[PDB]
Design a binder for this molecule. Structure first.
Ligand code: CLA
Ligand code: CLA
Ligand code: CLA
Ligand code: CLA
Ligand code: CLA
Ligand code: CLA
Ligand code: CLA
Ligand SMILES: CCCCCCCCCCCC(=O)OC\C(C#C[C@@]12O[C@]1(C)C[C@@H](O)CC2(C)C)=C/C=C/C(C)=C/C=C/C=C(C)/C=C/C=C(\C)C=C=C1C(C)(C)C[C@H](OC(C)=O)C[C@@]1(C)O
Ligand SMILES: CC(=O)O[C@H]1CC(C)(C)C(=C=C/C(C)=C/C=C/C(C)=C/C=C/C=C(C)/C=C/C=C(\C)C(=O)C[C@@]23O[C@]2(C)C[C@@H](O)CC3(C)C)[C@](C)(O)C1
Ligand SMILES: CC(=O)O[C@H]1CC(C)(C)C(=C=C/C(C)=C/C=C/C(C)=C/C=C/C=C(C)/C=C/C=C(\C)C(=O)C[C@@]23O[C@]2(C)C[C@@H](O)CC3(C)C)[C@](C)(O)C1
Lengths: 40, 189, 183, 48, 107, 193, 193
């Protein structure tokens, strides 16, 4: 790491890609553990 | 001119090696010139890590050829896959990976130039080299042992697979015959 | 030859938590340097809250295996199965009481930017000291260090208990007896 | 379980094997992890 | 002639395991129209170890190209007079790239 | 301290430092304080081990019952080698727990022997001065003050004796175990070992 | 050093430098030191080899047992050539291990015989001053101080005698081996050589 590499990792596209990857992973793992849910 | 005191038909015109004696055991041995394209500190850290890993690996290879824990009823050449299926290699990978993530942060701070000499984690609990006069001598002993253990482990695995025997790792005619024979030899052993 | 190294890991540069005056700051254990990013007071409050919850959790995990309430609707001395065996209204009321307690214990002091606005709220001090141990001021430091170390130990302990129950399917001391069985 | 030193020996001796007969080059290669052994290079990429 | 080529398998998470069709040979996967199978058969790659080692060599060459790209912009960047040697570039491409690639591939 | 100013020496090696391999010549003083502490701990452990192994070999057992259902003589029916495995597991765990507590307490004593303390000198009360830990004031070494009637010279002489007996007992207990494991190695070790 | 001021000379080749091929004139001083060291090592090896080969040819063996199950006379039941193959491989490996240690420690000494040392002057204690290794102070050459009663002139005369006997011993051991391998070459070897 560095004081300026973390600033690059703090940019909008890198953070957007990382957060969308985390959200997609969380939803995919929820679908893996709790599949085919229509009602609550 | 300053020729390299390990090849000496070639100079130390590999000036990426730096000043003479900056590292212990510096005999100017860089024929292929890896220091021209890579930093010296990172290469030194890789070298010392390889030295320590190969020392532990050589000792473990021989010890597993001799003794083992109860329940680990596996030979040395098949311990890898058997303990992977058992699950202990996952624990080894996890804990060694934690220590190596810490080492990664250490190398990142060292290459940016915090304070670190390569391979120095301060791990001297017994205080062998707390005397600064004996620091420079034990570094060379550590190096030479590590290099010899690298070669030793390579020979260990290659002769263990090639022949198929325990700790001597020798053929049948080298232990059940005569190697210092002076009679007229045949055409096979 | 690091000029200012960490007290815990001497091969690393000193983390910003070492410069803080909080209890336990003498050891510089922060290899990932999360004290550089997270506020130290907020992280200390979170650490103390997790520690206290884990002390109560470890004690309850131990006591649930042996003892029981006198005729509870579904005991099942296995705390992973016990949370599904017990009525859900009990959990609803317990979580509601905890929600009330921590809604009122800091009336507007949620979030990182609003909690430690007053420079008199030290982290982890919710004012809960009825017996007035904290009016001594000689054993205040040793009690703070005892609370912090016991909280961290209880965190690690409760994680171990939970995952041991996961890998065994049995409570803690039954699994421990099966470890030290005979062969 | 078998805790070493407590309800078990500390170090069980490994079974000793006599020395003989460099087997073949085509024997250990056809069961290795990278070269040949198409059922074992399919056994290297993880278990979990 | 009866086994359909397939080199791409999907993960069953959401019901998408229906895409793992019956391509033949006791295998389930998505059918491949790239023609890489016939390209490998034209090279004599009948074993599945040689494909793995070709992949490893490709990874090594990709790392080599990454290092060369860093090296020629940050360490040893050629001057303008180097690029303008179009006769030398033309000779070297026409012989060493094309003719030697044809010669080595014919071998 | 420096290896020259220690109490090892001895008339068996003539009155000089024995070290033939120069172990202390390649290491620091902080290493040789650890060496002295480890040597004295090894000597004391092996002195107790040699006496206990001789007692077990002579089939001398306590009159009574080790665990309810298990006699002392039932455990000591075989040799001392087949005696540690016949101890109940709870007893082995309690012995190891007591040794654990003793080692932790003796190491947590203040001036460590690698930072100013005397190597091999164990604190008299290892479980004293620890807050939230009350133990009686039984001394670990020398509870009944035998080494209070001795002067400095008698204490130095008996320390030299302790070092010599510790080394001899280390060789003896290794001889006992090796003679049991490999028959005919120690020829003085007849059958009952 | 220079080939002129060396101790070979001898009255057999008149009293001048024998060298007919001009080896010593084409090479520098360092090669002459190497040649003298190799000549003296060759002569000493050949002297020991000649004495041992004559002892083996006379069927003289030690009273006892070489390996358990293998008598000295059982190995010596044939000629000296078919005795080296009857020695167990472990014993020959131990002999070569001692020889390897001696050669390594001899060459590891300082002022190498090219770089200042005397060629052929092997010092008395090759295993002295080595860290991590200890040996008694038995000298390699003259464990008994036989050449301490001699003067300088007697030492020079006996060095000349050593060189002459070394050359004769090389001729002799090569004659023995060639006579065994090619019978009828050396007529002085009846059958048992
Ligand atoms: C931090 C502590 C810790 C813990 C809790 C574990 C837990 C485990 N390890 Mg393990 N391991 C660790 C550190 C740890 N590891 C480290 C640092 C290394 C070296 C890098 C390894 C190397 C390793 C290998 C090579 C193997 C394991 C295996 C195992 C499993 C054993 C399963 C079983 O039947 O138990 C067996 C139980 C016993 C034998 C009873 C005695 C064990 C005692 C009670 C442990 C003492 C407490 C322990 C040190 C916790 C720390 C306490 C703290 C105060 C320091 C289990 C998941 C094995 C595995 O995966 O098999 C499934 C295996 O083969 N581990
Ligand atoms: C909580 C579980 C537990 C317990 C109570 C013991 C208890 C014991 N083990 Mg042990 N052991 C364990 C887990 C355990 N082990 C595990 C998980 C492994 C696998 C890594 C081993 C591997 C092992 C070996 C290889 C040996 C023992 C030995 C011993 C005995 C002597 C201890 C000694 O000399 O230490 C002395 C004190 C130290 C070495 C200080 C270090 C303390 C820890 C290790 C750090 C003792 C009865 C020895 C034996 O059989 O002797 C009878 C022996 O040779 N153990
Ligand atoms: C015989 C010599 C030779 C060869 C083989 C090449 C080959 C190449 N040059 Mg090049 N070049 C040469 C001389 C040569 N040049 C000279 C003398 C000049 C100066 C006048 C230049 C100036 C130049 C510029 C300015 C550029 C190139 C580029 C390229 C690449 C074109 C892309 C392509 O076709 O991908 C084909 C890909 C491959 C064949 C993969 C192999 C890649 C390696 C590096 C090829 C050489 C391998 C080795 C020598 C053979 C070992 C054989 C061994 C296995 C036995 C290609 C790798 C362009 C490029 O892509 O830059 C990176 C580009 O911009 N060259
Ligand atoms: C492991 C136990 C141990 C340890 C730590 C020491 C440590 C020490 N001894 Mg000591 N000693 C021991 C066992 C031990 N001794 C035994 C068993 C004997 C009787 C033979 C002696 C006899 C002895 C004498 C006569 C003297 C010392 C002296 C010293 C001190 C300086 C020498 C030194 O650097 O040693 C460092 C030692 C080690 C690092 C131990 C390495 C052991 C290796 C790993 C194993 C080699 C043993 C080998 C396998 C043979 C085993 C079979 C055995 C039964 C014979 C030092 C404090 C000298 C002293 O105090 O001077 C003031 C001195 O004069 N010792
Ligand atoms: C004065 C004591 C003494 C004597 C006379 C012998 C005598 C002998 N030992 Mg011995 N030995 C001793 C102490 C002694 N040992 C000690 C203290 C140890 C432990 C370090 C050993 C370990 C030992 C081994 C490991 C071996 C011998 C062997 C031998 C025999 C050669 C011979 C009978 C060898 C033998 O023939 O064993 C049957 C053998 O392999 N000994
Ligand atoms: C390999 C053994 C060996 C070596 C290294 C030497 C070395 C030396 N001898 Mg020497 N010598 C030897 C054997 C050896 N000798 C034998 C066996 C005899 C008896 C015939 C002599 C008789 C002898 C005399 C009389 C004198 C020397 C002298 C010298 C020194 C100067 C000559 C020189 O530079 O030649 C260097 C020699 C070599 C590089 C060896 C080359 C050998 C070739 C490669 C093989 C030829 C062998 C040939 C085929 C015969 C083999 C069969 C044989 C059994 C008959 C030099 C230090 C002179 C001296 O000391 O003056 C100061 C001197 O006056 N030597
Ligand atoms: C298991 C493998 C192993 C291990 C752990 C070591 C460990 C060590 N070697 Mg080493 N070495 C090995 C194999 C090994 N070596 C092999 C195969 C070779 C090639 C022959 C070498 C050649 C070598 C050289 C040339 C040197 C070392 C040195 C050292 C020491 C470095 C610093 C030091 O303590 O100096 C301080 C030295 C000591 C404290 C010496 C004490 C060591 C004694 C001999 C222990 C007694 C062991 C005992 C006899 C049991 C062994 C049984 C075995 C013979 C079957 C260190 C203890 C250096 C050194 O200084 O050591 C002399 C050194 O100069 N080694
Ligand atoms: C119990 C005892 C304990 C120890 C006590 C002390 C021990 C003493 C100690 O060991 O010292 C050993 C020692 C010494 C010493 C001294 O230091 C002492 C002791 C006292 C001190 O003041 C003086 C000195 C001296 C320094 C010397 C050694 C010299 C040697 C070995 C020279 C060896 C020399 C072998 C040769 C020439 C072999 C020749 C082979 C030949 C000629 C072969 C042949 C033949 C024949 C077959 C014969 C015939 C044939 O014929 C045809 C065909 O024509 C020709 C040929 C060539 O084919
Ligand atoms: C103040 C002072 O001075 O302190 C004193 C203390 C003290 C005690 C009074 C002293 C003393 C006196 C005494 C009695 C000292 C006694 C020393 C004693 C009795 C030491 C036995 C060694 C036995 C060994 C090494 C066995 C090796 C056995 C070996 C190496 C093997 O056979 C191994 C091997 O078989 C395997 C395992 C497998 C095979 O494939 C390979 C081989 C064959 C190689 C001292 C020394 O004077 C110093
Ligand atoms: C101080 C001083 O002066 O030093 C002294 C030292 C010393 C020892 C005292 C001296 C002496 C005296 C002595 C005793 C000198 C002895 C000299 C001696 C006894 C020299 C034998 C040679 C035998 C040979 C060459 C055999 C050839 C063998 C040959 C060429 C073959 O038949 C080989 C061959 O059949 C094969 C193998 C097959 C095919 O390839 C074909 C051929 C045919 C080619 C000196 C000389 O006075 C000098």
């Amino acid at each position: 790491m560095s004081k300026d590499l973390l600033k690059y990792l703090s940019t909008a596209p890198v953070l957007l890609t990382a957060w969308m990857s985390l959200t997609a992973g969380m939803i995919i793992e929820i679908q893996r553990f709790f599949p085919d849910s229509l009602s609550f | 001119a300053a020729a390299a005191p390990a090849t000496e038909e070639a100079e130390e015109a590999e000036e990426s090696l730096g000043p003479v004696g900056a590292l212990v055991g510096d005999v100017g041995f860089d024929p292929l010139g890896f220091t021209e394209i890579l930093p010296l500190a990172w290469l030194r850290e890789a070298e010392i890590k390889h030295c320590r890993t190969a020392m532990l690996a050589t000792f473990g290879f021989a010890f597993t050829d001799f003794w083992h824990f109860p329940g680990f009823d596996y030979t040395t050449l098949e311990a890898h896959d058997a303990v992977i299926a058992q699950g202990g290699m996952s624990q080894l990978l996890l804990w060694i990976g934690l220590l190596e993530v810490f080492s990664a942060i250490s190398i990142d701070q060292m290459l940016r130039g915090s304070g670190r000499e390569p391979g120095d984690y301060g791990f001297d609990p017994l205080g062998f080299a707390s005397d600064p006069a004996k620091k420079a001598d034990l570094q060379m002993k550590e190096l030479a042992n590590g290099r010899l253990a690298m070669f030793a482990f390579g020979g260990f695995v290659t002769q263990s697979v090639l022949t198929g025997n325990t700790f001597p790792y020798l053929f049948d005619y080298q232990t059940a015959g005569d190697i210092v024979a002076i009679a007229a030899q045949g055409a096979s052993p | 030859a690091i000029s200012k190294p960490s007290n815990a890991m001497p091969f690393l540069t000193a983390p910003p938590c070492q410069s803080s005056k909080l209890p336990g700051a003498e050891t510089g254990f922060d290899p990932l340097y999360l004290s550089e990013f997270i506020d130290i007071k907020w992280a200390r409050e979170a650490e103390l809250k997790h520690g206290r919850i884990c002390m109560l959790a470890t004690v309850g995990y131990i006591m649930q295996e042996f003892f029981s309430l006198p005729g509870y609707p579904g005991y099942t001395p296995n705390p992973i199965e016990a949370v599904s065996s017990t009525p859900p209204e009990a959990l609803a009321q317990i979580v509601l009481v905890l929600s009330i307690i921590e809604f009122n214990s800091n009336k507007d002091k949620w979030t990182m930017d609003t909690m430690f606005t007053d420079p008199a709220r030290e982290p982890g001090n919710l004012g809960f000291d009825p017996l007035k141990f904290g009016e001594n001021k000689e054993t205040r430091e040793r009690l703070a260090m005892a609370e912090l170390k016991n909280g961290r130990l209880a965190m690690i302990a409760f994680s171990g208990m939970i995952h041991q129950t996961f890998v065994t399917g049995k409570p803690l001391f039954a699994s421990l007896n099966d470890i030290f069985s005979s062969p | 379980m078998t805790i070493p030193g407590l309800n078990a020996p500390g170090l069980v001796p490994a079974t000793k094997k006599p020395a003989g007969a460099k087997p073949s080059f085509e024997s250990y290669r056809d069961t290795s992890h990278f070269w040949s052994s198409q059922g074992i290079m399919d056994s290297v990429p993880k278990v979990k | 002639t009866s086994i359909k080529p397939s080199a791409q398998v999907v993960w069953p998470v959401v019901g998408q395991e229906i895409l793992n069709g019956d391509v033949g040979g006791g295998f389930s996967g998505v059918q491949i129209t790239s023609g890489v199978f016939q390209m490998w058969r034209a090279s004599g790659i009948t074993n599945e170890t040689e494909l793995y080692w070709t992949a490893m060599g490709g990874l090594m060459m990709s790392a080599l190209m990454v290092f060369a790209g860093w090296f020629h912009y940050h360490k040893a960047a050629p001057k303008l007079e180097w690029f303008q040697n179009v006769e030398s570039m033309m000779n070297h491409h026409l012989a060493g790239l094309l003719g030697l690639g044809c010669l080595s591939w014919s071998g | 301290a420096l290896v020259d100013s220690m109490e090892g020496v001895g008339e068996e090696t003539g009155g000089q430092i024995w070290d033939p391999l120069g172990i202390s010549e390649a290491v620091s003083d902080e290493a040789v304080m650890w060496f002295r502490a480890s040597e004295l701990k090894h000597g004391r452990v092996a002195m107790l081990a040699s006496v206990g192994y001789l007692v077990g070999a002579a089939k001398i057992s306590f009159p009574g019952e080790l665990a309810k259902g298990v006699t002392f003589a039932s455990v000591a029916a075989n040799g001392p080698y087949q005696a540690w495995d016949a101890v109940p597991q709870a007893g082995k765990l309690q012995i190891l727990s007591i040794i654990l507590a003793l080692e932790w307490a003796t190491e947590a004593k203040k001036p460590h022997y690698m930072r100013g303390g005397v190597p091999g000198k164990i604190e008299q009360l290892p479980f004293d001065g620890i807050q939230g830990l009350w133990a009686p004031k039984i001394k670990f070494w020398d509870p009944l003050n035998f080494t209070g009637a001795l002067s400095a010279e008698q204490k130095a002489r008996k320390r030299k004796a302790e070092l010599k007996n510790g080394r001899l007992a280390m060789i003896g207990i290794i001889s006992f175990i090796t003679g049991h494991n490999l028959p005919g190695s120690v020829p003085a070790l007849d059958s009952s070992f």
